[PDB]
Amino acid sequence: DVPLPAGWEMAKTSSGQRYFLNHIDQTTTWQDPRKA
């Protein structure tokens, strides 16, 4: 739950796209929520 926030969609593309979804907020996030 720490390496990957809970309620977040954690998926990284080999294209070099690290995206995180807020499955709670219904929002797309490009920048890692752990660094803010």
Binding site: A11, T13, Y19, L21
Partner: peptide
């Protein structure tokens, strides 16, 4: 400069 990301609907990529 990112290209549009996964749709929120259910799952990003299959």
């Amino acid at each position: 400069g990112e290209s549009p990301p996964p749709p929120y609907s259910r799952y990003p990529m299959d």
